[PDB]
Amino acid sequence: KQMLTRKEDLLTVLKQISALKYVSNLYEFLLATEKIVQTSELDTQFQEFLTTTIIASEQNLVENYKQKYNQPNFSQLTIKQVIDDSIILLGNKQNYVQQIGTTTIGFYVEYENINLSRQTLYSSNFRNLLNIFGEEDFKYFLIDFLVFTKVEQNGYLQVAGVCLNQYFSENQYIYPEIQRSQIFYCNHMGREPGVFKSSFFNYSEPQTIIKKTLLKEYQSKNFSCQEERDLFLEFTEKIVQNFHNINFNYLLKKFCKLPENYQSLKSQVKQIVQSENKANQQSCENLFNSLYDTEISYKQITNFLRQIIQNCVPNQLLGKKNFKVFLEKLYEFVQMKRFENQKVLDYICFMDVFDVEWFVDLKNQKFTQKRKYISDKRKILGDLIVFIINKIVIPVLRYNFYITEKHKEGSQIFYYRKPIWKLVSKLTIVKLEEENLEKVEEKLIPEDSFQKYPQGKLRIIPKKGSFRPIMTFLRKDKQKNIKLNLNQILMDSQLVFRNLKDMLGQKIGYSVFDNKQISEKFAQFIEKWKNKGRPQLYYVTLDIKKCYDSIDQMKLLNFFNQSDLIQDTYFINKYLLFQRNKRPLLQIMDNINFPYYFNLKERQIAYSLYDDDDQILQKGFKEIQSDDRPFIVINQDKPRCITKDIIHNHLKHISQYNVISFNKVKFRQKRGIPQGLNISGVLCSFYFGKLEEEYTQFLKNAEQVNGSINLLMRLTDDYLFISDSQQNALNLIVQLQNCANNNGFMFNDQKITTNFQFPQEDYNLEHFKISVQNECQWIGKSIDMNTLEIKSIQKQTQQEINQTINVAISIKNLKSQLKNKLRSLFLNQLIDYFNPNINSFEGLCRQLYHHSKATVMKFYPFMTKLFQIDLKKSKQYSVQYGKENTNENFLKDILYYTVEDVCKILCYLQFEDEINSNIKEIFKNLYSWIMWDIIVSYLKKKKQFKGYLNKLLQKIRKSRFFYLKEGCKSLQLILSQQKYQLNKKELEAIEFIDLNNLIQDIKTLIPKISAK
Amino acid sequence: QFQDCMAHITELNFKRNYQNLTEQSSSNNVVAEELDIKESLKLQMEYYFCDTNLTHDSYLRGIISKSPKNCVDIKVFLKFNKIQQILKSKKDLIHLIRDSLKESKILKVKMDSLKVKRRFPFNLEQALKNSKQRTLYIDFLPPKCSKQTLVSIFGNFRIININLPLQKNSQLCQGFAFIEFFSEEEANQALITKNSSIPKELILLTEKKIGQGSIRIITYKKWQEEKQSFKELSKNQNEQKNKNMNQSRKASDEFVSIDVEIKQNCLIKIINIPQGTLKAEVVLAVRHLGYEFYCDYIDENSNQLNDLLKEGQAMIRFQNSDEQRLAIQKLLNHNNNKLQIEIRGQICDVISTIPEDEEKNYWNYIKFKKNEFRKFFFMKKQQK
DNA sequence: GGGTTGGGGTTGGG
RNA sequence: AUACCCGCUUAAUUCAUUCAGAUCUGUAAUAGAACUGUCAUUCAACCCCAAAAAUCUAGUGCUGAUAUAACCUUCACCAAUUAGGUUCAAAUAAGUGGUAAUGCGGGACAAAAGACUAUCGACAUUUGAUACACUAUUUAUCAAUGGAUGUCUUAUUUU
């Protein structure tokens, strides 16, 4: 079967595209056109360039460019003149590589932008190419072909032809959208409960005022006649009249009332605010917890909303049954998650058009065209639903509640009464003022920065016993001519610091940024441990508390000024990158295009004017590849320049004059840099790397002074250290404590996790709380101290799992959405730690087992939501899956194809291309059986799947088991032929398979892989 | 424990019919010394859905079949004829019934559920045959009323129940009655004692309801055995002569319609319809008026071969004459008040009233269509 | 009299 | 749980009143009584890094298996634990957690073959052809097809 390969050729990939009919390298094209002959001699560099250059065309034009004996080939014009002639011949066409950064004016061409690819076009290789070709043929070759030149080991740069991005590109009604997002984060409070004074409910105090304030709905195009509009206006008048008779205080007191000790909490808050001395930490934590335990329940809020709706909206506006359906769906909407939303169709598909009685049709289409009448009335029913919701429900929730999410509860939603949130805000302000925030006056801040930079907003998330402030910088000042926010202003410096991050990795400290770096460091340490001979290992884990706020602005500025890794001037280049996806190559239904095999990404890069080794000036890109598969890059014509002085000014401004607002009250930071800026992580990493390299001198020489293996990484403020010497670990702890004492920062909770036990009295570590565990846990990862294997940490309950899942389903692209979602869920974390250099076969099997067990529970809500819609009413799916078991067939197809793709990717990641195809197939079958067994075991108890689907899944699992057994049996005969010589990895795989006795059954490996 | 359950079940219905014979005779009672109202309601209700009663009832089985699991509400029992007599609150009555049946042996009860559950499901037809074997047919009963005497004197063999019809015939005790025995073995034993009857006389004529006329004391199976031939002769006989049945069935559907079913004024003819206009468009144009009508697409101008004059004319038969007049008002096109309409982009002419002879002929072929509609089904059925 | 590029989508670490 | 039909659902005072302005009273300074205005920079959505990406009509070795097996069985649902069955599918379960539960009051025709012109080209069906729709529509006419529908049965209250 088709397998993914780590090594691929651009020509081979291009020959698999149906649109392109002629694909060949330049040398063979020239030989076919007889412009050159084999007996002719050329320079070795020119020959290599001709061989490596790849051209392609939509049609076969070899005859058109055949050598003509009418006139020889001699060149007298310049290469620029030939290029200008070709560009002029191109005319009005505006999608070609050669036109980038230039414009045509009559028979004159003008260059006005920087294009880094022009060097290849005007190179001596292209000069000799033109000399061989001739002007008249070159001008048309630059248009009729797509030219790709190799500039790296696997990279190619397109220099001519139609831009590749061009290949990556009667109306129907679209219903409005429920504005659910407006409910969150409303800090406003009013003397009388109800809605905002700006609403039409309060603005009215006749039909004239209501019409004026509700024109947007009154003059809608869905209304058939003026009588319908008048009836709707009368209904709105009745709604407005009914609204003013609602006792909001009584409703609140009945359904969602304040706790009994609310007065006590208010008195405590007032006393804490008025107290001059610092408040008691445990008392404040208890007050925080007591305030946070006053949340309202979903059922309570649903009853509140239902009671509000019933006595305010006439029952005949929607119909007797439709009103009840809407009320029932209101609860589902209420309990709906943060980044999730409902749709109008969710109500329309379940109510009946004919229930409405006041609907009138100008033409008697009720009996002639029932479907047309139904559509016409649906267009009005949806409008009514959207109006009711977005005009009553959302404003009430916004005005009378603060709605947000907690710290460690994921995406789950919580509600709090407004006075409780006012008390929480006062207490949080009191807490922040003493530590890091100060009330500020606009007189102090200079007007230059005042008009040059926008300010930020502050948001508070509840936490167990405390809070968690978050400051945002999305806003932009309409006045003072500001059109960008802080991130848009600073993304240039962000690019510069991202460039800095590359040499920040290994030069001046121990900093890591991605799982690839973590994995390669782990692999190197594992190899060194293997060389040493598997001795005992000890680990220590600690982290910094509030790293961002503990940053010295003067020290950071001094480091920035004296750091030579940042050059004076930089240039910004933009380019497009085309990269191979994770899809195997089809072997030759007819519509095959570039997006089927390549992914388009937009990239920016900053480069210095030095004669650097990477010579970015020659190429225009800097990309890292983990495989030999090719990729294509095309440049752009939008360059930018950034100077170190501008970065210095930005850093000084953000360090000194950082201004944020809260409840229309301005604040200013006193220490550290604000979290949430795009440069904060890199700046923090650099700042702490300086101190850690200052205080970790001994580690630089320890590995050869006494030959001790030791590994230290720091991700942002989190530290992990594994070594062989308890003395080395203790020395590191002591040095880190000394550095913290000297630089005025501290570690979180005074807690440290170790693998050993030592007397803390000797090293003045009495205040520390040492926790001893035999299994290390770092950044959510689980590491063994015995086999030195790594696997991720997964939750254990469906309630925990569901809190972090947002479900969004659209009928238009069900197949694509579900396939991509399942693919992402499986490949989220497993691909980054499936390195065979780290785990053994058993370790990989266990990792896959646990990850699949987590992912199935993760994805279960998706099919639960899917079953709420019957696909038999949709032709697009019924024609493909019948009408009896459409849902079951659709789910089976999705699961089967997703599992097959995941297994193929897993085999590609695990094995190299040199391994035997039989071994690859056997391992793929084993993985498929594991996944299907997990899925079947999970789903065998569910009631919705209890019938038709389970038999199909059991059949699939049985087929996979049979195929695995058959492959294992045939592999013995295959190897017995002596036709193949096995390497060490193949021998290891054979030994593993024979030890686990995969020939007969799987019962041997299950205890080893399912152990927890 | 089905083997336990089966034996456990067989005890219950035995205790049930045991109580039934006692309560009708009022032989035993606990009265009010130790309440026992719980046992009284127990006997009452699991008799109310005992096998024999449901065999006679055949309704509570349906009502429990309505429920998915067949668990049924307590409230249904409160409306019963002789249940409310307990007296002395429905929220309390449900708890009383529930803790009365909490130790019951045929009713599953738990977690204060609102439903009650007989512990053995359906098995209606199987009980029908077993009871039929146990039942016995009696056809020697003079009209004398000695029901209590009958039950007190028939204490000779174990009898499940005596089904004496009431008021089906004249007076109270005229019917020939039905009796079931404890088992098929008990019925065979009663047959062994040749014509088991009152002890003073079992083979000869006597007094009272059991006066022993033509002594047809046989079980249900031989009762149907003797039924078989006599019933089947009458049931089969000979098939009805099918030649004239359709002609007889013509009359009402054929020869009165034009004035009884649809009045002659309800018919409206349309002319000058261009060829190439499918009748769907024409019926849509008539539907534009909104009334109910029958469309006879006039292509056969002879009005009773594939007539060549296709789509030229049309016939509309409304349900009501007043609706026809309302359509005429609608067809009175207010722009010109002309008896015409446009179909497929072409204006065609309509006829408000047709001469009564042509109306009668059109109704005649309409009734011919009705007769052949009745003929197709009649010939279809005549072979069965 | 016009004018970055505005989104779509929401997982797992920090 | 058919949740089939109907009705209302503690239906009654306030649990509570930020910020700002404007009054009265008191105070060794605290406070108390009453009033008015009020989402926003008019839009709200935190960031870093990495992940995936068909214009998803295109797709399975469509599936021979491990009685050391797989299925099935409880008065809602889910989460789990035990007992019992069956050999390509049916029969009869016992606990333990969480969650839905509102609640009351009133209500509750059978079935295997018939007698059936009682009605119907104005009956009903799988379809199949056309139009009206299509983002998860509730259908009109011809074609074909043959029963369908409605009563009485055979049956009846410790219903």
Curated annotation (Swiss-Prot), chain A:
Main location: nucleus
Molecular function via GO: metal ion binding; telomerase activity; telomerase RNA binding; telomeric DNA binding
Effect the entry attributes to changing S782A: Does not affect reverse transcriptase activity
Phenotype for K751R: Does not affect reverse transcriptase activity
The entry's keywords: Chromosome, DNA-binding, Magnesium, Metal-binding, Nucleotidyltransferase, Nucleus, RNA-binding, RNA-directed DNA polymerase, Telomere, Transferase
Domain of life of the source: Eukaryota
Record annotation: effect of changing Y548A: Decreased reverse transcriptase activity
Outcome following mutation: F168A: Strongly decreased reverse transcriptase activity; strongly decreased DNA-binding
Residues noted as binding Mg(2+) in the record, renumbered to the chain: D543, D717, D718
Effect on the protein upon substituting E405Q: Slightly decreased transcriptase activity
Result when mutating T787A: Slightly decreased transcriptase activity
Mutagenesis / variant outcome for changing R191A: Decreased reverse transcriptase activity
Phenotypic consequence of Q158N: Decreased reverse transcriptase activity
Function text: Catalytic component of telomerase, an essential ribonucleoprotein enzyme that copies new telomeric repeats onto chromosome ends by repetitively synthesizing the short telomere-repeat sequence 5'-TTGGGG-3' using an RNA template component TER. TERT is a reverse transcriptase that adds simple sequence repeats to chromosome ends by copying a template sequence within the RNA component of the enzyme.
UniProt protein name: Telomerase reverse transcriptase
UniProt source species: Tetrahymena thermophila (strain SB210)
Swiss-Prot record, chain B:
Record keyword Nucleotide-binding present: no
Domain xRRM: 261-384
Protein's cellular compartments: Chromosome, Telomere
UniProt record, GO biological process: telomerase catalytic core complex assembly; telomerase RNA stabilization; telomere maintenance via telomerase
GO molecular function: telomerase RNA binding
Gene inactivation effect: Critically short telomeres. Reduced accumulation of telomerase RNA TER.
Alphabetic keyword roster: Chromosome, RNA-binding, Telomere
Limits of the RRM domain: 134-222
Main location per the UniProt record: nucleus
Record text on subunit structure and interactions: Component of the telomerase holoenzyme complex, composed of the catalytic core (the catalytic subunit TERT, the telomerase RNA template component TER and TAP65/p65), which is associated with two heterotrimeric subcomplexes: (i) the replication protein A (RPA)-related subcomplex, composed of TEB1, RPA2/TEB2 and RPA3/TEB3 and (ii) the CST-like subcomplex, composed of TAP75/p75, TAP45/p45 and TAP19/p19. TEB1 and the CST-like subcomplex are tethered to the catalytic core by TAP50/p50.
Function field: RNA-binding protein required for assembly of the holoenzyme telomerase ribonucleoprotein (RNP) complex. Telomerase is an essential ribonucleoprotein enzyme that copies new telomeric repeats onto chromosome ends by repetitively synthesizing the short telomere-repeat sequence 5'-TTGGGG-3' using an RNA template component TER.
Domain topic, free-text comment: The HTH La-type RNA-binding and RRM domains cooperatively bind to TER RNA UUU-3'OH sequence after it is transcribed by Polymerase III. UUU-3'OH-binding by the HTH La-type RNA-binding and RRM domains positions the xRRM domain to bind to the adjacent proximal stem-loop IV and central dinucleotide GA bulge.
Protein name per Swiss-Prot or TrEMBL: La-related protein 7 homolog
UniProt organism field: Tetrahymena thermophila (strain SB210)
